[PDB]
Design a protein around this nucleic acid. Structure first.
Ligand SMILES: [Mg+2]
Ligand SMILES: [Mg+2]
Ligand SMILES: [Mg+2]
Ligand SMILES: [Mg+2]
Ligand SMILES: [Mg+2]
Ligand SMILES: [Mg+2]
Ligand SMILES: [Mg+2]
Ligand SMILES: [Mg+2]
Ligand SMILES: [Mg+2]
Ligand SMILES: [Mg+2]
Ligand SMILES: [Mg+2]
Ligand SMILES: [Mg+2]
Ligand SMILES: [Mg+2]
Ligand SMILES: [Mg+2]
Ligand SMILES: [Zn+2]
Lengths: 55, 100, 196, 64
RNA sequence: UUAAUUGGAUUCAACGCCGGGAACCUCACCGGGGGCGACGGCAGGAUGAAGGCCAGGCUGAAGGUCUUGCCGGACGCGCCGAGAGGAGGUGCAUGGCCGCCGUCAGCUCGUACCGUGAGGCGUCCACUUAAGUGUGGUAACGAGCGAGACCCGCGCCCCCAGUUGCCAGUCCCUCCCGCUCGGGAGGGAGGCACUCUGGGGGGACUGCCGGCGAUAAGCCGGAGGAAGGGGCGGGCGACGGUAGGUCAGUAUGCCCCGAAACCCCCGGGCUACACGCGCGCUACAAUGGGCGGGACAAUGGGUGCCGACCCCGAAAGGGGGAGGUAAUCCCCUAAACCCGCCCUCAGUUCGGAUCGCGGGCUGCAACUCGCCCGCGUGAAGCUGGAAUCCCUAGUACCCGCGCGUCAUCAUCGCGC
């Protein structure tokens, strides 16, 4: 076929297996407790999720 | 013959309101209740670099989420069991009921 | 464990809220509320123009319900549309309105002054508006409008003041609009009264 | 430095004029009285106000 | 230097920084091979458009293409516009966010008054404060934002609560020693005393005493006290400037590429090496090295996972596998420290770089280019010029541990 020359392989580990669910970036993904967010995206949506800066 | 009730929430006031409702229900009848036991709080702490780029001094944010818990043990009585099954929690409280 | 459950719910609401905020922009979106019932999920949407949300005899409410069920994970959804409570005490709504007025073609000073006059008329202790971007030329600039009482630093500014931000896309580029409002019933720590 | 704050002074002076025969040279008595006569909700602010009122009472009793 | 060794940042305020520990991916670089044009129109097209394949060449490998002919029925990149997508240019076109000046004490307004005016005054003087923090005097009188207040944690006490946490006293059974008057250890009933967990409340105010200052604001020194003078440690950064950083996190104008600057696959590179520099780790030994034995933590984490317990192996590891969605089960019987013996000031029983041989684990793949174990090998280094950094109390030095990253890999980051 022809569309086979456009599909990516289904990776199970490595940096290529995880993307931010809000912007699609590869790299600095926060994996704690199942979050999948960049360090950039988490900073601006943290107050809505209920986190606070106590100290 | 005894039922175990677990509660959890991020808001400390709603937890106490639901627990007080249960305590009033139990007192409003003849039934023995093992008082609301406070279990250790869950803290979720996440530390992140602030700047989007890598230039400048390195500074950090420390975000925190706190989850409070309670534990109540009461003997299963049909007159009182229906009442505690009829009480409806606020949307930010989790409740689970089991038979031991 | 228990922590993983709480975090999972907060993310779904955030994703849905951002999707709707981008979607129902012309209707004056003002937040949402999600409730779970044994029969399914009740979703309340706050807006100032329910007619746009419903969309000419359905055909859009069903669209939203179906998308909410497929793209996101709500089970058995049921959407109800209501009216925003205090439109003039909501900073997000005011920011979006100012941005739309700018996109219409109105000069930014007139927009800002009209908005402040309305907000202060409807009974707020203070309001601040900041507008930044390429206003009047190709070198960018920021201007600021203010009147009333407004806290800025410390815990009371964290809990009492409402904040909102919006973008305005013009022909030359984007303009940023920021709004902060302090409600009428807010009380500061140093306001102490003698009982008679 | 231990500089007294402005609004503490203002509220304390208002209390002293309005109820002159209500406070003594005792700190505990004034603490309870201030707790009852205002809507102050912070424990620390209450202590500051009571201390200043005690000083006012001893100073006027001296006649300045 | 190279086919390429992709790019940003250069005093403080670039150089274990971009959460940058890159085998593939990441990826933007180099060699090579493939794929893609909504919507309009032109050629063409059921006398079948576009599209798909058993075998075999081409090829790194490929119905990609060719050979060989079979399958499918309606649109059409061979042509013209247009579009999708762009880690392509511009941070000197912008938004948002961040660093620094600086957690410094500043920046302003209403009315009056002074000056032709730009401006001034208030915001100045004296004393005081961490502070434009206060008290008096004043052509000023009054206000706003910042400071303080506020929010989280630690230290002392009281009430409520008793499980998955705790075990002192009392009771039953079993097993040990000096043979048991006495002293221990487990288990069961039983209790919430003590510790702990976490809701509420109390407690400290320059309140008391003596001085100085003005008799004011305050300062200095004492008692009592768990705590004494922002009680201690943190969060929160005003109006603005820096054409400071970021369009290579996302949003976005203009300019470009648009059958390649878009989308996939294979192999290389970012790991090169006469040399200059930053930050560290290991040492140069006795304030030690080795061998045997004895002690005492806290923070966190676990279902794509943590794994006790049994068996096999010299080790690294291998084969089974209880319990655990967790105050219950597991990671988890730390090191510095103490006791006994060997070595006696030496390039050594100091140091452990470099290299040979052999055995393992993760992974689709370990050569370029991973981590671990056994025997062998045994480099420089004997305390450091001119210079220069960090730190005021449970702080600095010394010692290990947890989490992030993570299939595997910690001389790093954040905490204990
Ligand atoms: Mg402050
Ligand atoms: Mg380079
Ligand atoms: Mg590596
Ligand atoms: Mg690579
Ligand atoms: Mg004049
Ligand atoms: Mg002057
Ligand atoms: Mg001030
Ligand atoms: Mg700039
Ligand atoms: Mg610049
Ligand atoms: Mg590199
Ligand atoms: Mg040795
Ligand atoms: Mg190798
Ligand atoms: Mg020597
Ligand atoms: Mg690193
Ligand atoms: Zn992101």
């Amino acid at each position: 076929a022809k569309a086979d020359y456009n599909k990516r392989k289904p990776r199970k580990f490595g940096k290529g297996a995880r993307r931010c669910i809000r912007c699609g970036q590869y790299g600095p993904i926060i994996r704690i407790h199942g979050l999948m967010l960049c360090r950039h995206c988490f900073r601006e949506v943290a107050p809505k999720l209920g986190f606070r800066k106590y100290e | 013959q005894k039922a175990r009730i677990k509660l959890a929430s991020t808001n400390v006031r709603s937890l106490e309101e639901v627990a007080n409702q249960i305590k009033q229900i139990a007192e409003r009848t003849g039934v023995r209740m093992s008082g609301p036991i406070p279990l250790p709080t869950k803290r979720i702490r996440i530390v992140t670099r602030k700047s989007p780029d890598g230039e400048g001094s390195a500074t950090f944010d420390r975000w925190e989420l706190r989850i409070h818990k309670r534990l109540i043990d009461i003997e299963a009585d049909e007159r009182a069991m229906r009442q505690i099954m009829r009480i409806r929690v606020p949307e930010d409280v989790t409740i689970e009921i089991e038979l031991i | 464990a228990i922590e993983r459950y709480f975090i999972r719910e907060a993310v779904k609401e955030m994703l849905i809220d951002e999707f709707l905020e981008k979607e129902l922009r012309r209707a004056g979106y003002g937040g949402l509320d999600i409730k779970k019932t044994p029969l399914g999920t009740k979703v309340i949407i706050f807006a100032a123009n329910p007619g746009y949300v419903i969309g000419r005899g359905g055909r859009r409410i069903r669209e939203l319900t179906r998308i909410l069920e497929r793209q996101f994970g709500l089970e058995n959804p049921q959407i109800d549309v209501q009216e925003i409570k205090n439109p003039y005490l909501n900073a997000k709504v005011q920011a979006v309105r100012i941005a739309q007025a700018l996109e219409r073609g109105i000069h930014f000073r007139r927009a800002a002054y009209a908005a402040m006059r309305a907000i202060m008329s409807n009974g707020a202790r203070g309001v601040e508006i900041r507008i930044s971007g390429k206003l009047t030329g190709e070198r960018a600039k920021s201007v600021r409008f203010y009147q009333g009482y407004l806290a800025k630093v410390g815990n009371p500014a964290e809990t009492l003041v409402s904040k909102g931000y919006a973008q305005a896309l013009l022909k030359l580029g984007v303009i940023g609009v920021k709004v902060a409002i302090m409600p009428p019933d807010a009380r500061l720590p140093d306001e102490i009264e003698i009982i008679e | 430095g231990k500089i007294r704050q402005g609004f503490i002074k203002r509220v304390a002076r208002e209390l002293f004029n309005k109820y002159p025969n209500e406070f003594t040279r005792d700190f505990e008595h004034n603490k309870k009285k201030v707790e009852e006569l205002t809507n102050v909700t912070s424990k620390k602010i209450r202590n500051r106000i009571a201390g200043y009122i005690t000083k006012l009472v001893r100073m006027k009793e001296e006649g300045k």
